[PDB]
């Protein structure tokens, strides 16, 4: 679509930016904590 595709891309980019600003630090922190626990277990 000449116009709907642009709107969908804009919405997807905005959602990705919002997730990176908000919902990216917590998942990375959880992964880092799991890795630290695994390292301690070894």
């Amino acid at each position: 679509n000449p116009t709907l595709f642009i709107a969908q891309l804009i919405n997807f980019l905005l959602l990705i930016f919002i997730l990176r600003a908000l919902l990216y630090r917590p998942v990375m922190n959880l992964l880092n904590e799991r890795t630290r626990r695994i390292e301690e277990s070894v």
Binding site: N1, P2, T3, L4, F5, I6, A7, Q8, L9, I10, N11, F12, L14, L15, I18, L19, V27, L30, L31, R34, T35, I38, E39, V42
Partner: protein, 266 residues
């Protein structure tokens, strides 16, 4: 912030349709849902081999996230029944991982915009745009090559029947002739409630398939409608809700499958 919601460039209408049969030049015709399902299977297998080709202690990167999610799923299923937490884990894990990425694919741009075809143009004084699509010629419909795999009543039906078969077989695996004793045992009023139990057990896979298909299709339709209303700065909360609910329903499918397994074996 409140002056940039221009509607001059947007879709002309809100196209709504069921699964559209793809061209299918050779035999055994395929649809737009099968190709995306295959590509998501390929992505899942690629991620699996990436997390598998380099397995070691102190996981880090993709392998760490994969192991974290897998152990969280094992913990969640163990909270229901530890007897079959591993014997049935691959099925629920595969279904969950497939449905999550299927729901995620619907958010990818071009879904409903790319067509295989087998400002001034927009209407003024109206909240919705009227810009004609690229395939508008030949009186076509701009068949979406990319569609959500769960938005089709065939993939959901297939996973529902395979889950029902697995649950029924695992229940009959170790139950003796106990299935019939729970259905219309002719012991007072227990027979009638057993009849309702049998009916509910029969209708469970249909309910699951219809629920997942309707949820994903409604998500895609609401996204299309919100795009038609205002092209941008409108649908951020709705896109976030859809991305949340897709993974939520994906985990729900596996959890309900395990729960039905436990309620059938016990």
């Amino acid at each position: 912030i409140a002056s940039r919601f221009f509607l001059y460039t947007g879709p002309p209408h809100v196209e709504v349709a069921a699964e559209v049969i793809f061209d299918g030049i050779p035999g055994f015709p395929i649809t737009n849902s099968f190709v995306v399902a295959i590509i998501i299977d390929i992505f899942v297998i690629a991620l699996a081999v990436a997390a598998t080709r380099n397995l070691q202690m102190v996981p880090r990167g993709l392998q760490n996230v994969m192991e974290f999610i897998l152990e969280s799923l094992y913990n969640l299923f163990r909270n229901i029944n530890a007897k079959y937490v591993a014997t049935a884990f691959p099925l629920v894990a595969t279904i969950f991982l497939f449905v999550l990425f299927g729901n995620w694919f619907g958010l990818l741009p071009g879904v409903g915009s790319i067509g295989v075809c087998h400002p001034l143009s927009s209407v003024a004084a109206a909240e919705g745009e009227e810009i004609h699509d690229t395939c508008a010629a030949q009186g076509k419909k701009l068949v979406p090559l990319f569609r959500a795999p769960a938005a089709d009543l065939n993939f959901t039906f297939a996973i529902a029947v395979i889950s029902f078969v697995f649950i029924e077989y695992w229940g009959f695996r170790a139950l003796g002739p106990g299935y019939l004793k729970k259905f219309f045992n002719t012991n007072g009023i227990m027979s009638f409630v057993g009849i309702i139990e049998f009916i509910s057990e029969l209708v469970k896979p249909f309910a699951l398939a219809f629920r997942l298909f309707g949820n994903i299709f409604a998500g895609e339709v609401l996204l299309v409608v919100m795009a038609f209303l205002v092209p941008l700065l409108l649908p951020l909360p709705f896109y976030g809700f859809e991305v949340f609910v897709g993974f939520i329903q994906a985990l729900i499918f596996a959890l309900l499958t395990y729960a039905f397994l436990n309620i059938a074996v016990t």
